[PDB]
């Protein structure tokens, strides 16, 4: 019943830029803080990025700040990463994620996006 679905990841070159989005659905939107998870191909997930129900309070990974901006449009349901200034260390697969702390199962997550930020040259 809860569905998450991520759009706008790809292939980049350094310097460059992508916006993520996530729709969902199958709860109550603004009830949940939401955030965006990153996992590079030989390390566990971490949470890159963070934002509150309202959309009034924000967190980034140090790794990010100042390059990257989260929000939400609690009125279409949908979350955003704006990725700027891309790295190749910011390579990885991006999940949406809903942070639900009272639920005891683990959060749900987007099927995922790749960003591969990369020069053939």
């Known amino acids: 019943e809860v569905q998450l679905v991520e759009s706008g990841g790809g292939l980049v070159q350094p310097g460059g830029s992508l916006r993520l989005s996530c729709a969902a659905s199958?709860?109550?939107?603004?009830?949940?803080?939401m955030g965006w998870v990153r996992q590079a191909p030989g390390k566990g997930p971490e949470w890159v990025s963070l934002?509150?129900?309202?959309?009034?309070?924000?967190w980034y990974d140090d790794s990010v700040k100042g390059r990257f901006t989260i929000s939400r449009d609690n009125s279409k349901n949908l979350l955003y990463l704006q990725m700027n200034s891309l790295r190749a260390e910011d390579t990885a697969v991006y999940y949406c994620?809903?942070?639900?702390?009272?639920?005891?199962?683990?959060?749900?997550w987007g099927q995922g996006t790749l960003v591969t930020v990369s020069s053939l040259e």
């Open positions: 994620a809903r942070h639900a702390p009272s639920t005891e199962a683990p959060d749900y």
């Open positions: 199958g709860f109550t939107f603004s009830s949940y803080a």
């Open positions: 934002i509150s129900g309202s959309g009034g309070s924000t």
